Subunit: 155 residues, 6 copies
């Protein structure tokens, strides 16, 4: 009965995120994507959840749920104590390590880091939005659904 | 007579800070903890509260004193006849920026900066992260002086 | 026919920037300093002021010109028939973020980014730190071109 | 049927290693500690395996096996495709990332990184040996069994 | 007339190297790939083999030539009337050491070093790691020029 | 009564080292430069040569003395009744390894390690790189004290 939580705002979910979801889903019996409620972003929580659900339909053991407050509480309240977090090029890994040690200290939750695929290693939700805002083509970097939804917000 | 200044907002002081204070006090004749007054820096504790929390925490350090300060750190340092800063390193420290500031501070005022890593036990606490965790009911009592922890629960009530 | 773009907000240009300009001008047939402007946040200097300070300190570089822009850097670059960015590295540079943007810029527009470390003497100055230090009286005169220093003091007073 | 491999020379196994073993054993159904054969070290492969087995006796789902050649082959030949690797203070993380991306590329094996506990974050097999060699006390940093075995090699 | 030197042992040349070669050739009038002769550096391919593998790989780059070299890189560079080095960055690059060498090379000879990150697809290959993986039957054919891969299987037989 | 140890192999001492010595001597009552020797590998200079080169370039520091040692640095430090190490940081420093050793040294012996960034001008010299560059004719005269430079050339010839 293994399980891990993949946390983020996912505003919107990128292929970097999806790659890590897929790896977590492949290595743990159960995966929960934890979507932060914290309203200043582009998509509402429902939209962000929809985009992830749309993009992970072939992952039967993954579910998507919103959450707020301490991540470790989100994880523990679901009977788990593992976080799986992706690494990309602009990741502040020092801060990730700090949070990982804090999360272990206060709640006994482990954090496993996995580098996303090289092809998806330079996209981030923020940079994708920024580039798309100014007409740049990020279609190769987002789930096809997300990409269309993004164009909708901009136009 | 040797001396160094340990700078920060300390909002609140953590055991990470205290560990470095203790090491500074052990290695310099005089240590001044310089507590930032910053009207436009958002914070939880007043300067007087922050100073008092540090004084409680450093009661066993007779050669360390706590003072408020504003503006250029190197002026604070040089005004007190010193020319050394002792700053802690923790997990999540922006060390590249620390280096930049250290080189800037040496250039503009001749002040040296000595960095000390805090003990592993206290390496992942920060003032900001302690506040955030405590705000949502997380137990950071092992990472803060007892008196600080008590005051923190007080501000959150 | 070779060429590169040297981007930044240059608010104000520093000697660290000028070092990088000089190296780009020495290695590419033409160099365009791209003064990138956020239309939704005024900096300390207006665009015309930023450009004037850069021109005055680059007058000895015949193959360098200065233009402002906004939006995607790669559009600025490609619209000038170029395909290269030269970006300086200094102490405190967020290199991981620079790498991320370089890989993104190559992906969306085929533009290459060349990084060069600025000279040690100028390696700890940044526009932001120079402004912050000068704000509180610190002497940054040796880290800025003459075209900048007193104009900076002027803005602050 | 989840599983991961924890690889190393483990010469000798430290509490930093053990902490990560325990986390991997807690989060995966099956864990294999892969002990490299590559003879220039202090302990023989049998001794290194013994020390790990001794230190992990309360981990029923962990086993210890020697291996050589490509790690991904070791992992795949056991029906797995996950590596769990620890991070400590002196870890060359850039090289770890390079190897992780290479291992994913050539064999579809994921690497999950987990930071060892702060208390065990500055011990390494090499530094423990070096310090102990010169009379320094590393007993708080090694399994009690290992520590005694180390003193035996030195004296 | 602009120019840069791309230095390495290239034992063997990888698609990471080639990507950077291509970008250099696109941005400078002349590029020289400088192939290290190093009697005490253990290696798999002879200098002539390494040069030939690079030439095969760069056949479409008319302004790039491949030459062997020994000793101080900056002398190699300056002897050919150039004063720029273009070096790739990959995952596992010791960038702090690269920076040190770049600053040293600028100091002793006035030679600039421009760094370019190789494409993400080729960011995790290195000459050493390719050899090690191939030695144990791992497939690195997607990471090497075809001719290189063929020669590599040949050396391992 | 305050004091610190400045450790290294100093083979040879560089101006980067001397910078750190001067800063330690200015901030601690006494400083001991610890010339740490590996009895199982001769460097370029014998212990007496290393010490002589350091003494000649530190003659203006009355509170600094120079001694050799081997084995655990913390034993060298504690045997002199001290509890502090001052270690320089430069470009190319393996800081993670320094941090690891600092935490280990605190753990086994209660000794504190203070890090200080050496001056930008001396930030890219290292004993090893200076030796390598000088080996192939590169001019490192501005990065080494006079007590070293020609003795270095002597060893190489
Ligand atoms: C799977 C994956 C994650 N990341 C990092 C994304 C990230 O941290 N976004 S974030 O805005 O900062 C963030 C972090 C933690 C949070 O904790 C909670 C979440 C829900 C409820 C309460 C707390 C919330 C938001 C990735 C990067 C690349 C490839 C894959 C991945
Ligand atoms: C573990 C540890 C981390 N730090 C860093 C703390 C820090 O930087 N806080 S800060 O908010 O950003 C900051 C920095 C510099 C300042 O300079 C002045 C101070 C007073 C008057 C004028 C200027 C002010 C605030 C420590 C420092 C000392 C011992 C231990 C540690
Ligand atoms: C669980 C854990 C691992 N490490 C890192 C230890 C390490 O890499 N040792 S190593 O000598 O370099 C090494 C690496 C990979 C290898 O791959 C193979 C192994 C067996 C057969 C074929 C290949 C072999 C040796 C840790 C650090 C701290 C806390 C916990 C951990
Ligand atoms: C992806 C990528 C990585 N690198 C680094 C390759 C590298 O450093 N190899 S190295 O063995 O260590 C090396 C370095 C410098 C040298 O200088 C001389 C060369 C010739 C004659 C005298 C000196 C020699 C060897 C690249 C470089 C160019 C384009 C792309 C990339």
């Amino acid at each position: 009965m293994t399980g891990a939580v993949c946390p983020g705002s996912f505003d919107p979910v990128t292929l970097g995120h999806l790659d890590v979801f897929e790896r977590a889903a492949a290595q743990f019996d159960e995966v929960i994507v934890a979507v932060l409620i914290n309203p200043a972003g582009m998509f509402t929580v429902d939209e962000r959840i929809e985009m992830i659900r749309e993009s992970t339909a072939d992952l039967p053991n993954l579910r998507v749920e919103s959450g707020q407050g301490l991540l470790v509480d989100f994880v523990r309240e679901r009977g788990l104590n593992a976080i799986v977090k992706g690494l990309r090029t602009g990741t502040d890994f020092e801060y990730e390590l700090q949070m990982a040690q804090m999360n272990k200290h206060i709640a006994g939750v482990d954090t496993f880091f996995v580098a996303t695929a090289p092809a998806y290693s330079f996209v981030s939700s923020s940079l994708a939005k920024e580039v798309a805002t100014y007409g740049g083509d990020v279609s190769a970097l987002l789930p096809a659904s997300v990409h269309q939804r993004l164009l909708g917000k901009l136009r």
